[PDB]
Design a protein around this ligand. Structure first.
Ligand SMILES: *[C@@H]1O[C@H](CO)[C@@H](O[C@@H]2O[C@H](CO)[C@@H](O)[C@H](O)[C@H]2NC(C)=O)[C@H](O)[C@H]1NC(C)=O
Length: 471
C-alpha cells in the first residue's frame, strides 16, 4: 500500500459507499418523530386529521423512494460515461449528497413534508452513482494483485455505514425529539471530507490513457498509485486489453432478453437479484425498532439492542472473504437462502409464543442476528460474482443493467410494502420472507451450475442442456 492508494480508498469509500449504508439505517430511529411531524403538518394544512393508513403510506414512500432514486442514479452513469471520468463523477456526485442533506434537515423548519420525500429521492440518486462508479475507480487505480480484495472494501464500508446510522440514532446522541433533523444534516460531513481530499489525487490511469488520450498523465498516475518508476508493463497491459475490447460489438439489453442461447442465464440473474432483496434484509434496516417492539423487547432497551444488528453485519462482512474462497458459489448461495428461510421460521415461532415465558423475546434477537450472519457470510456477495461468470465481455454490460434494474425495483417493493404486511399478517409477517428464501433456494438447487474455478466454455455448456440453443 502506497500513500495515495490509501487516501483514494478511504476518501473514495467514506463519501460514497458509507453514505449509501448510512442512508439505509438513518431512517429507523427518528420514525416516531417524523410521523408526528407528518401528522401535525397534514391536519394544519387540510383542516382534517390524518388516518392511520395514509400516514403509514407516507412513511413507506419516504423510506422506499430512495430506491427509485438509486435506479435513476444507476442509469445516469450510462449517460455521463466518457464525459467526466471516474474521479470527477465522484466529486460531482456530492452535489446530490449536500443538496439532499439540506432538503431533509430543513424540512421541519419549512413545515413541509414533501421536502423530506424529495430529499430521500435525491440522496437515492447519489447512492446509485456512488455504487456504480466507486468499484470502477478502485479496481482501475489498484495493483493487479489486490483487485480481488476491493470488492470486499466497498462491502465493509456499507456495513460501517449502517452501524454508524444506528449509533447516531441512540437517544444519548442525535435520536432525540429536539435533534432528529441533524441525523440528516450530518450527511454534509462525509461529502465535505471527500470534496476536500479527492481533488489532490490523480484521476484513474486507464481513463487518462484510453478515454482522455493523454499518455503522459496516465504514466504519472500509475507512478503515483503503484509507487514505482518503471510502469511500462502497466501501460501496455491496458492498451492491449483495449485493442481487444475495440474489436467487440456489444449485445443490447432488449437483444440479451430476446436471445434464446442465454435464456436460463438471464432468468437465473433475475431470480437471484430478486431473492437477494425480496428476502427482506433491507426491511431489517429500515424498520428494526418496530420489529423489536412487536417482538416484546422492553421499550427502553430497543435502541441499544438494535445497535447489535449493524455490529454483527460488520463482523460477518469482514470474514465474508474467508468463506467465499473456500466453499464455492453453489453451496454458499443455496445454503445461504436455505438458512435464512429456516431462521425466519423460528423467528415467527418466537414472535408468536412471546407471551409464554419472559426469556422468549430475547430468542428473537438471536433469530434476527442469525439471519444477518447467514446473509453476509454467503448471499451478500455472490450474485454480482455470478453475473460476471455467466456472460461474455460483449454481453456483460447489458447483463448488469438487467441485474441492477431488478435489484433497485425489488428494494423499493420491500421498503414500500413491509409496513402493510406487518399490519395484515401481524405476527406471521416473516413467513412471506421464509417463503421467498426457500423458493429461491429450491430454484438455485435445480438450475444453477457450479462455477468456481470453471471457464465460460464449461458453464455455458452446463446451461445449454435447458437453453436447447447455441449462438
Ligand atoms: C395524529 O396526532 C394526534 C395528536 O397527537 C393523535 O391523537 C392521539 O391519539 C392517541 C392514541 O389513539 C390518543 O390516546 C390521544 O388521546 C389522541 N389525542 C388527541 C388530541 O386526539 C392521532 O392518533 C394521530 N394520528 C395517527 C393516525 O397517528
Amino acid at each position: 500500500w502506497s500513500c495515495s492508494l490509501l487516501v483514494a480508498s478511504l476518501a473514495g469509500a467514506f463519501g460514497s459507499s458509507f453514505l449509501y449504508g448510512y442512508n439505509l439505517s438513518v431512517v429507523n430511529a427518528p420514525t416516531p418523530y417524523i410521523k408526528a411531524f407528518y401528522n401535525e403538518s397534514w391536519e394544519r394544512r387540510h383542516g382534517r386529521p390524518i388516518d392511520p393508513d395514509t400516514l403509514t403510506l407516507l412513511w413507506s414512500v419516504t423510506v422506499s423512494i430512495f430506491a427509485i432514486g438509486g435506479l435513476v442514479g444507476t442509469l445516469i452513469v450510462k449517460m455521463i460515461g466518457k464525459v467526466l471520468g471516474r474521479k470527477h463523477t465522484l466529486l460531482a456526485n456530492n452535489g446530490f449528497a449536500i443538496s439532499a442533506a439540506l432538503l431533509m434537515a430543513c424540512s421541519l423548519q419549512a413545515g413541509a413534508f414533501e421536502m423530506l420525500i424529495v430529499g430521500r429521492f435525491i440522496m437515492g440518486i447519489d447512492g446509485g452513482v456512488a455504487l456504480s462508479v466507486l468499484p470502477m475507480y478502485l479496481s482501475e487505480i489498484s495493483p493487479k494483485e489486490i483487485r480481488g480484495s476491493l470488492g470486499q472494501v466497498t462491502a465493509i464500508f456499507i456495513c460501517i455505514g449502517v452501524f454508524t446510522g444506528q449509533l447516531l440514532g441512540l437517544p444519548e446522541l442525535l435520536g432525540k425529539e429536539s435533534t432528529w433533523p441533524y441525523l440528516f444534516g450530518v450527511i454534509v460531513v462525509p461529502a465535505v471530507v471527500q470534496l476536500l481530499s479527492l481533488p489532490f489525487l490523480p484521476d484513474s490511469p486507464r481513463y487518462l490513457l484510453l478515454e482522455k488520450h493523454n499518455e503522459a498523465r496516465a504514466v504519472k498516475a500509475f507512478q503515483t498509485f503503484l509507487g514505482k518508476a518503471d510502469v511500462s508493463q502497466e501501460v501496455e497491459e491496458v492498451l492491449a486489453e483495449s485493442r481487444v475490447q475495440r474489436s467487440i460489438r456489444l449485445v443490447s439489453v432488449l437483444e440479451l432478453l430476446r436471445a434464446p442461447y442465454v435464456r436460463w442465464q438471464v432468468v437465473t440473474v433475475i431470480v437471484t437479484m430478486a431473492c437477494y432483496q425480496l428476502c427482506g434484509l433491507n426491511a431489517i434496516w429500515f424498520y428494526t425498532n418496530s420489529i423489536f417492539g412487536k417482538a416484546g423487547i422492553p421499550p427502553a432497551k430497543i435502541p441499544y439492542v438494535t445497535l447489535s444488528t449493524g455490529g454483527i453485519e460488520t463482523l460477518a462482512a469482514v470474514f465474508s472473504g474467508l468463506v467465499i474462497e473456500h466453499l464455492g458459489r453453489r453451496p454458499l448461495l443455496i445454503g445461504g437462502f436455505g438458512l435464512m428461510g429456516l431462521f425466519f421460521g423460528t423467528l415467527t415461532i418466537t414472535l408468536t409464543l412471546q407471551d409464554h415465558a419472559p426469556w422468549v423475546p430475547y430468542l428473537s434477537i438471536v433469530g434476527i442476528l442469525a439471519i444477518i450472519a447467514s446473509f453476509c457470510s454467503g448471499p451478500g456477495g455472490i450474485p454480482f460474482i455470478l453475473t460476471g461468470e455467466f456472460f461474455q465481455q460483449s454481453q456483460r454490460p447489458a447483463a448488469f443493467i438487467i441485474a441492477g434494474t431488478v435489484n433497485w425495483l425489488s428494494n423499493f417493493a420491500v421498503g414500500l410494502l413491509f409496513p402493510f404486511i406487518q399490519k395484515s399478517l401481524d405476527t406471521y409477517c416473516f413467513l412471506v420472507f421464509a417463503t421467498i428464501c426457500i423458493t429461491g433456494a429450491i430454484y438455485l438447487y435445480f438450475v444453477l451450475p457450479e462455477t468456481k474455478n470453471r471457464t465460460y466454455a464449461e458453464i455455458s455448456q452446463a446451461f445449454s442442456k435447458r437453453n436447447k440453443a447455441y449462438p
